[PDB]
Every structure is written in C-alpha cells, then in structure tokens.
Design a protein around this nucleic acid. Structure first.
Ligand SMILES: Nc1ncnc2c1ncn2[C@@H]1O[C@H](COP(=O)(O)OP(=O)(O)O)[C@@H](O)[C@H]1O
Ligand SMILES: Nc1ncnc2c1ncn2[C@@H]1O[C@H](COP(=O)(O)OP(=O)(O)O)[C@@H](O)[C@H]1O
Ligand SMILES: [Mg+2]
Ligand SMILES: [Mg+2]
Lengths: 100, 100, 259, 417, 259
DNA sequence: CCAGGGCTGATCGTGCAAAAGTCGTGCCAGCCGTCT
DNA sequence: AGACGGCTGGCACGACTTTTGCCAGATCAGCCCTGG
C-alpha cells in the first residue's frame, strides 16, 4: 500500500508530536533540536493475521494493528535550528493535499 | 533462490535459526536439517564462512599462472608463451602425442 | 421412529383386519402386492407400509406404469451414463438407483406391456442393474410395492402377462374391502369429509345429516369407493353453503341439470 | 421424438503441442517467464564507486543480547536468557511457552521457577514489557512501573487483571456491573490503559523497503490517457548472426539439419513472445479504455465488468483474456493494482443501472468510517441508506462486504465518547 | 476352481444326471443351451457351469436379451470408439469385449429381438467383430451360455426365431426336470427354506410339519418348479407366527376371498 | 538441351468446451438489548 | 427475571463466471529425376 503522512505515529509520546501540525509536518518557526520528528511518515505492513492475539490487540487498542511502522523523518544527531519554511510536492493524480 | 548464488542448502541458513520453508524454527533444533528444504539450523554468521563450487564441465586454464612475468606452464613444457596462448584459445591445434 | 399414521378414518370390520395384517409386513423384506378396486385408497396403505418399515428414512419415489414414454422407457427404468448416447450432457440417475434403502411404488401392473415386463424381469430377483451405455454394474436393495386393478391370474391364462413376473411378485396379496361392500364406515367417512370441507370454506360449523341423505347413500352402487364419496360430500356441502340445516339433497352427479 | 445418434457441424478447431506450449506461454508473469526463457536460451545455441559494505544494524534481539552481556547472571542463567531472547518475536512477545523453553534446555535441575526468575529479570530491559507471554502480562508490567501518584491506577489494574474479555467485547455495561466501578469516571482509566504502547518491541527498528515492479504503464496526455508497455521489464530475443550464417556453409548433413531445426525453433519462439506482448498490450489498452472513469474519479465510481465485456471489444477469446490477465501489475498515477482486480461482480441498482461490487464496498468503508462513535451503524441501516442512494444490496451482501473489509460488527466497535 | 459349494440342495437321480453332465461339459469350450421350465435354478446351473471350467478366473458378465435398447443395440453389443458420433468421447467396451477369457451368459434368449438375432450370429460363430467406427477387425473368445423356458423347435417353425442361429448354438442342450419329478426331495427343500425363513423372522426354532401338511404339499400340480415352493412355505410359516405346535396350515394361493 | 512428373519438406495456425469456482440472496440458529 | 425483537453468522440454493486441458493435418513450392 502507499505510504502516508498522517501523524498517526505509533510508539511515540505526546511531547514528541507537540510541534507537528494536523498533516504531520512541523509548524513554520518551531525550534527543533537533536532527534525530534519533522515529518510523520508511516510505512504499511502486511495484513493483520487472523490469530486471536492480534484480534485481541485490535479489539482492545485498535487503529494500529501493526499496519504501520515508524519510518518518520527525524533531525540528525547534533543538528539544531528553527524551521524557516517547508515545501511539499504532490504528483498529478494524487489529491491528498492535507495542508499543501 | 534455489540452487544458485545467495542460496540456501549452500552457504548456510538465513538471518536467524529458522529454515527457509518455515518449519523447524527455534533454538530447540540445533543441528537438524528439514526435509522439505535442506537447511542446517545454525547461526547466520556461518553464511560468511561457507563456499560453493562450479563444476566447469570443460577444463579451463588459470590466468595467474602462464601470464605472470615468468610463465609457469611455459617453463614446465619448455613451450613459448605465444604458442601456449594460441593453443589456449582454439586456433592452434597443438599435437599431443604420436611417435610413429 | 414415529407413528406416521397420516390420514386414517373409517376403520372397522374387514378394513381393520387388513390394517392388522399389513402392520407386520413392513419388517419383512419380501415384495408385496395389493389388489383392489380403482380408487380404494390403495396408495395410502402402500405409503404407510414404507413408513412402518425399519428403514423408513429411505427416500420415497413413485412411478406409474400407465405413464411410460416408450422412447425414454429404458433410460427412466435403469439409468443412463454420461455420453452413452448423443445429447447426454451429464450423468443422470435412474429411477431404480434413485431409491436405495427406500421403497419404490409400482402402479398399473395390470396395464404393464410385455416390453416393460421383459425389461424389468431380472432387476427384481437379484437386485442387479447395469445402466444403458454402462461399463460396470450396480447392485441395490429395494422393497417393491405394487398396486393393480384387474385379475392377474386371469391375464396370465389370457397370455398378456408372464407367470414368471407374477410369481416374482406374488409373495402375498392384500385385498382391500370395497366400501360399498363394507357399508360400516360410510357415515364416518362422509361426516369426516364434511367437517373438512365446511372448515375450509371458513363456515362456522357443520349441521347434521338428513335422514333421506342416509337413505339414498346406501342405495347407490358407488363405483367410487372413497374417491367419489369425498367429492360428492364436498360438492353437495358447497351447494348448500350454510349451517342452516342438515343438507336434504346430495348432488350425486354434477352433470345433472340445475332444473 | 427420439434417442438417436446424430451429427451436424457448426464449429471448427485445431491445435498442435508446440502451439499448446505457445498458448500457455502467456499465462505467467514476466519475472517467472524470464526463468523459463533463459532455460530455452541455454538449450538453443543460436538464440540470444559502487556502494558496498553497508553498516550493521541493531535489531531487538541483538539489543537484548547486548544488555544481557552487561548483566550479572551465572552461566546457567546466561544460557537460559540466551534461549529466552532467541525465542522472541519482532512485536516483543515470546512465541513458545515456558514449558517448551524448559524442554529446550532439557536439564533435570532446571525448573519452572528458575526460568521464571530469569525471564522476570530480563522483563525489565529497555523495551518495557518485552518478552511477555501474552497481552495480559505486558500492560501490567508498565502499569506497575508507573508511579503510584497518577490517579486511576488501581482501577486500570483491576480492569487489566481479569476483565480482558470484558474490555475486548466492548461490553462496557457488563464491565461496570462486574467491577462496581464509577459511571463515566472509568473513561479516563480506560484511556490510561489505551495509552500504554502495546507491542513494544516493534519500535526498535521500523525500516521497510520499496518493492514495486510495473508491467503496464499509463500516463495522462491531457485527457484520454494512452498506454505503453514497460520497456525495461519486457523480454526480447535476438537471432544470432554468426550461427545463422554458417548453416549453409556447413557441408555435413548432421550440422545442417541441427542448425535448420534450431533456427526454426528460435524463430517460432521469438514470434510467440512477440505475439504475447502484443496481446497483453491490446488487452491493457482496452481495459483502460473501459475504465477511464475510475482512474479519474475513484474506486466507488467504477462500472462493473465481466470478461465477456472486454473480450467482445477485441477479437480474442474469454479464455485468452483470462490467461493474459494473471499476475500482471499495471502502474497508474493513483497507484499499482492488478489487471485481474478490475473485473468484479455486478449488482443491479435503482433506475435499471448496475454498480460494481468493489465500488459499493469502498462506499460502505467510507460511510462506516464517517459515523458517530457513540451510536454505530448496523448492517440493516447500511442497507437502508444504500437503498436511499439507490443501490439496494441485501443485508447479507452488506455483512459480507463488511467482513471482507475486516471491520468488526457495529455492536463491537461501540465506544465511550 | 478346486472347491465350490453354494446352494444346490436338491438331491435326486434326475438332478444327479444333469449335475454330472454339467461336470463333463464344464471343461469343454463349446457353447451350451440350458432349456427347462420357469424357476428351476437355471442361473444356479449356468453360474456353476462357468465357474467349474478352466476359465473361472476370467470375468463373468451377464445381460438380458430384452433389456438393452433397440436404438443403441449395436453400441451395446460391440461398443464404439471416440468421435464415431457426436455424443461419443472415449472408446467404449462392449459385452463381447469385456467378457474376454470369461463367459457371456445370455438370459431369456427366446425374447431376443429379430435385430439381436441377425446381429449376434456372425460374431458368435467365428469371433470377428467390428467396433463402431473401427478400422481393423477384432477377435475375442467367449464361451456362450444361454437359458430360456420356451420351446425352440416349435418356435423356429413359427418363424420368430432364426433357424441357423439355433443350429449353431444347440450343441448338447441341457434339460432340467420339473419339481414333480424329484418327489421326496421337496420335503428337504421345504424344511431348509422354512428354517431360513424362521431364522429371518426371529422365531427361535422350526417346530416341524404335520402329516396333513405333508400330504397337501406332496400332492399338488406345482406349475412353478421353484421360487413357488419357497414362497408358499415362507408365507405359510409367516402366517403361523409361532412354534408351539407343528406347521400345519398350507396356503398354496394367496389369491383367495376375504376371511 | 528443354519440358513434365514426383517428392519432400516448409508453412499455416492463439479457440471450444467442460467443470470447478464464485456470485448474490434466503433460511435458520444463537446471543444480546429492553420492557414488563 | 422472562419474553419479545433484533443483530449476526453459517449453510444452502440457483445463476452466472472462469479456468484448464485439449495435442495435425493437408496443401503448396522448389529441386531432382526422367522423357521428348
Ligand atoms: N382410511 C381412510 N380414511 C379416509 N380417507 C381415505 C382412507 N384411505 C384412503 N383415503 C382417501 O382415498 C383417496 C384416494 O386414495 P387412492 O385410491 O389410494 O388414490 P389412487 O387413485 O392414487 O389409488 C385419498 O385422497 C385419501 O384421502
Ligand atoms: N437346487 C436348488 N437349491 C436351492 N435353491 C434353488 C435350487 N434351484 C433353484 N433355487 C432357487 O431358485 C432361485 C433361482 O431362480 P431361477 O430358476 O434361476 O429363475 P429362472 O428360472 O427365471 O432362471 C434362487 O433364488 C434359488 O434360491
Ligand atoms: Mg393411483
Ligand atoms: Mg430367468
């Protein structure tokens, strides 16, 4: 399946996603240091197995299903600064355009 | 792939103890070989220590000899490198034996 | 196992004797034959004979020898394999093989032509049949039940029936007493059919029976034992159409003019 | 009106074994085709700085072994820990059960209590709740880890202890009457349970690669997209001039006949491959012509089709198109799909029209997703508003679509607002 | 082939002669004709005659001369090849081809149609047979056994039977005697049959007959040789229903008036 | 030396149909919500 | 607390799709042998 930038990143704290907009990219002017998240990207995994363990996990928690993995864009170690401006490019035929 | 480069049943198993087929996958099996696929259940670090061979139905010369500064085949046969080279590429038709 | 009584009315005298006789025939696995006048409720007892059997769960299928397409007779009787002849797209089960562990109803044996008699002559004694265009033979076990209308011994001397087939199906014969001779359950049959008809016409209740109606019932010859009695009761009660009084007149024949 | 052997022709047909091979040549994908093509190439003789030494990565098992190396175990405890961590999945839950681990060790002295001691010792490793037997003893570890100061902790522990099914079935009313717990003040405790990172071992490494190969390409030239084949992926064979120019020169009958037969076979193979490519291209062009609306507008605007509809548009047969459209992935700006994915069953709608099954399934998906969380929409109501739209599919088909969509029933997804 | 016991309870001089004649004719290859009266164990004889021969291990297949269809008659007799007609899709064996090495046992030859009579003679005489749509002749060897109750010498004079077909088939005909000729053995048959029947109907043990019943079963015409004695004894014992006192009631004809 | 006959190989051909499979839709059983 | 209504899923029954498994022959053209 296609990868999406939706900011629904698993195994992460609310403090990390504090600087991310609804689309998953940083606000213009935010200060970012070290290994914070810049763009929240997820890569789809295989279909959830019928196994009762995964079925129970979906029934309890939901919305994760191990469908996605955290392959987000993070600032490299020892790099700090303030975001000046972002630029997003979407190919023709794709009309996601969350905040583009 | 099966019976090729980067294959199993040669060069050792794959990343973990599991066999290629999927059965016999744990540390409980330490030296067994599966029947549906012949894959020894060992560490994957052995993948860098196991080598294979190619039959090479027709014989072939070794370029390290007969092409260094002295020629080993030349000095063994008392035969000059030019005729050695012409014979080793199917345009010279050297004589093997025949005394009558 | 259940009772499978179905519809049983007007049981008295020799009819009760016949029921008592047929009660123990079901356990046996010998062919049976029923003799009786046309429309003497012969099928009812033939059907109940299958249900009283231990293997009552066997499917029940019926054929009438008076209705056999001479073109398809062999295929219907035995069964045809796939591709045996042109136009046979799939394998089709035959009638004899259709029932296995279940009884087969035969009718109009007195009207059975020599052709059908010969074609069926062997499949009974040994229970062995091979399909038309067939490679290998099948074996089945079916209890045959037969109904007829004429004197099979008479047809045997006449020569249109084969004594071989007759004794092949002559273990025991059940003679159904005709109702015009019993004369003991005519009131009960008539009143039962009267309640059924008056109920299904959604009328409140059925009045009695006129004494003159009873007088003229016994006088009639009644060729229809229990197949025209029901019909005449239904038609006459429909003609009256009210619970006003016991119906004085029975419309014995509908063809009679209204005036 | 009879049974009689009769005969009357209205049809024609013919075929040879090599033609059978050529017609089965187009049933299979290109990557699998190239193997058999290389096999025939091997038989027929006249037919025909970089980045290296990548880095080593740290997976969960390697990280756990690293942490075991720096912890003070005995030799037996170290062997047990190595076995336990070897029996650990990517998600972080151990696969085999504890008695199986004891059997794998196979020592009389080794006991369940000892293995439990070692396992609980390694449970406190950096990914919390790793190597847990099941879900019950993975959330509990983190609840116990959290400091007692935060509220609703006792409530969360009581729910997670032995009310796991009670929470799984979303049967909040029975959960309340079982726990004797507060009304709508349990919601924050349930949310605390929700924010507990299930499957903790997943986050040690999450890199997933890109594996896409296109067989057919379509590009939008300002309306009415034209379809092209994949130039790189397509196979091709070229005759060999050296061996084609020595069959006549050879004066030996054996060599001459050998070269003649191999020339014949090679040319037939080349012709068959070219015909397969042409047929695939024509079929792809026709299906994209009949599916122009869906590429523009989305899956729910798809017209239903059958192999007959696409076979009548060409001169090929239904069987031929079915053989061609197997294991073929076409690439479009919207994404990568399969040629066999377009064909779907049809359902009749109001006004005489028909709607494709996948379109109605996607519509059901979006309609179910865009619903109020307090009151779920059931299959009967789904049928009702689909009939209002005019599709009028049965509740059985609604349930089948919902099940194949992997969405649980309406009464199962009900949740507190 | 060494040991074969089944049924054949009758032991008389007349039966001794024919059973010994069967032993002589069994190794011989020539076809035999089994004449007799209805219900006289004709199948029992033919079966034993084939299975006592040197070709017992070979397949044994029977057919009814009347049962098979007239339209598919040739295909049934010989078989067809794939593609001969529209329906056909594979080579189909006929009876004559399936019976290679073994025997073909025709049943009730007197009812065979004129078509079968003119079809069968040429292949039966020598051994040549052409399959439907065949390209080359086929040759199989089948020992022929046939049985019927009719009188062939009278039938051929009438003309519904082919003369040469009878002539090339009637080497050493076998004649069985009617039941009335056995005399004493009928008591043994009745005792055996009653024992089996009472075993089937779950009654413990046969009580025996009486002198009256003995005399009645001795002195009667017996129009049917066997399968009529079986039926009469099994019906009489069934009507008896108990073994407190010996079997005395005899019911020769089920067709009687109501009791 | 030119024309007639034989013979061998080169060339043509991607559909028909039968059976397995899939589809939609109904029937019935078992668990759950709610009022009496 | 029990009955009534409702929701969901397994199984079944036509109606329609789709998947595989078939296995050459005749006919024409050029070359060689032979008759005129
Ligand atoms: N014991 C009975 N009491 C009342 N009606 C009976 C009884 N037996 C048979 N009948 C009626 O006789 C009718 C005809 O039966 P029957 O003569 O067997 O039909 P068929 O003409 O097929 O032989 C049936 O409709 C049935 O209702
Ligand atoms: N000698 C015998 N012993 C026992 N049973 C016999 C004997 N002869 C005939 N039968 C009985 O006769 C039946 C065979 O009938 P059969 O005479 O072959 O009929 P058909 O005369 O039509 O060929 C068998 O069921 C068998 O029990
Ligand atoms: Mg009737
Ligand atoms: Mg007979």
């Amino acid at each position: 399946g296609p990868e999406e930038i939706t900011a629904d990143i698993p195994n992460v704290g609310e403090a990390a996603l504090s600087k991310l907009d609804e689309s998953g990219i940083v606000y213009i002017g935010a200060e970012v240091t070290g290994g914070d998240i810049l763009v929240g990207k997820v890569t789809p995994k295989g279909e959830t197995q019928l196994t009762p363990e995964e079925k129970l996990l979906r029934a309890i928690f939901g919305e994760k299903a191990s469908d996605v993995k955290d392959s987000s864009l993070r600032v490299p170690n020892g790099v700090s600064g303030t975001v000046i401006d972002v630029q997003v490019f979407t190919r023709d035929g794709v009309e996601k355009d969350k905040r583009a | 792939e099966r019976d090729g480069l980067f294959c199993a049943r040669i060069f050792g198993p794959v990343k973990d103890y599991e066999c290629l087929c999927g059965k016999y996958k744990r540390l409980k099996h330490r030296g067994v070989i599966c029947e549906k696929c012949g894959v020894e259940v060992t560490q994957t670090k052995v993948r860098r220590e196991r080598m294979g061979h190619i039959e090479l139905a027709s014989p072939t010369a070794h370029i390290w000899f007969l092409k260094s500064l002295p020629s080993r085949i030349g000095l063994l046969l008392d035969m000059p490198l030019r005729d050695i080279e012409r014979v080793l590429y199917f345009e010279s038709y050297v004589v093997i034996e025949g005394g009558m | 196992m259940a009772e499978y009584k179905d519809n049983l009315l007007g049981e008295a005298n020799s009819f009760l004797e016949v029921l008592e006789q047929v009660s123990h025939l079901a356990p046996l696995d010998k062919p049976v034959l029923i003799i009786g006048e046309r429309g003497t409720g012969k099928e009812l007892i033939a059907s109940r004979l299958h249900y009283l059997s231990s293997r009552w769960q066997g499917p029940f299928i019926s054929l009438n020898c008076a209705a056999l397409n001479e073109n398809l007779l062999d295929s219907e009787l035995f069964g045809h394999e796939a591709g045996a002849f042109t136009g046979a797209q799939k394998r089709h089960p035959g009638r004899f093989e259709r029932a296995d562990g279940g009884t087969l109803f035969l009718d109009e044996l007195a009207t059975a032509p020599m052709m059908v008699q010969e074609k069926l002559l062997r499949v009974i004694e040994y229970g062995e049949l091979e399909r038309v265009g067939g490679s290998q033979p099948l074996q089945v076990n079916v209890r045959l039940v037969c109904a007829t209308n004429a004197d099979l011994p008479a047809m045997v001397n006449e020569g249109t029936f084969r004594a071989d087939l007759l004794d092949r199906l002559a273990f025991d014969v059940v003679q159904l007493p005709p109702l015009r001779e019993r004369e003991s359950d005519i009131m009960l049959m008539a009143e039962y059919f009267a309640i059924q008809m008056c109920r299904e016409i959604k009328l409140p209740l059925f009045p009695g029976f006129t004494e003159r109606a009873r007088e003229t019932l016994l006088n009639y010859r009644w060729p229809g034992n229990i197949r025209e009695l029901k019909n005449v009761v239904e038609r006459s009660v429909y003609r009256h159409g009210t619970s006003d009084y016991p119906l004085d007149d029975i419309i014995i024949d509908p063809f009679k003019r209204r005036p | 009106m009879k049974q009689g052997l009769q005969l009357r022709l209205s049809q024609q047909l013919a075929m040879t074994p090599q033609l059978q091979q050529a017609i089965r040549l187009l049933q299979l994908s290109t990557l699998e085709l190239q193997q058999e093509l290389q096999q025939a190439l091997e038989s027929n003789p006249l037919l025909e700085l970089p980045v290296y030494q990548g880095e080593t990565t740290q997976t969960l098992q390697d990280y756990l072994m690293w942490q075991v190396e720096l912890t003070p175990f005995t030799d037996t405890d170290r062997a047990i820990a190595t076995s336990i961590v070897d029996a650990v999945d990517d998600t972080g839950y151990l696969t085999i059960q504890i008695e199986d681990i004891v059997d794998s060790i196979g020592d009389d002295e080794i006991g369940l209590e000892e293995v439990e001691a070692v396992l609980k010792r390694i449970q406190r490793f950096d990914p919390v709740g790793v190597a847990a037997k099941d879900l019950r003893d993975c959330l509990l570890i983190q609840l116990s880890q959290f400091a007692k100061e935060t509220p609703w902790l006792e409530e969360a522990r009581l729910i997670i202890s032995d009310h796991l099914d009670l929470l799984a079935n979303h049967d909040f009313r029975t959960l309340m009457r079982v726990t004797r717990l507060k009304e709508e003040v349990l919601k924050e405790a349930v949310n605390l349970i929700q924010s507990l990172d299930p499957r903790p071992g997943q986050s040690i490494q999450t890199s997933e690669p890109e594996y896409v190969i296109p067989d057919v390409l379509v590009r939008k030239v300002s309306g009415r997209w034209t379809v092209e084949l994949n130039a790189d992926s397509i196979p091709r064979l070229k005759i060999n001039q050296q061996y084609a120019a020595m069959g006549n020169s050879a004066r030996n009958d054996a060599d001459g006949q050998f070269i003649r037969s191999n020339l014949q076979e090679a040319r037939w193979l080349i012709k068959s491959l070219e015909s397969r490519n042409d047929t695939l291209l024509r079929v792809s062009r026709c299906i994209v012509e009949q599916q122009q609306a869906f590429f523009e507008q989305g899956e729910e605007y798809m017209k239903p089709m059958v192999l007959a509809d696409i076979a009548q548009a060409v001169e090929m047969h239904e069987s031929t198109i079915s053989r061609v459209t197997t294991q073929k992935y076409l690439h479009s700006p919207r994404g990568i799909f399969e040629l066999k994915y377009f064909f779907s069953s049809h359902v009749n709608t109001e006004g005489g029209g028909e709607a494709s099954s996948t379109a109605i399934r996607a519509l059901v998906k979006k309609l179910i997703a865009a619903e109020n969380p307090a009151k779920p929409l059931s299959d009967s109501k789904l049928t009702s508003m689909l009939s209002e739209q005019g599709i009028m599919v049965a509740r059985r088909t609604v349930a089948k679509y919902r099940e194949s969509l992997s969405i649980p029933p309406s009464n199962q997804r009900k949740q507190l607002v």
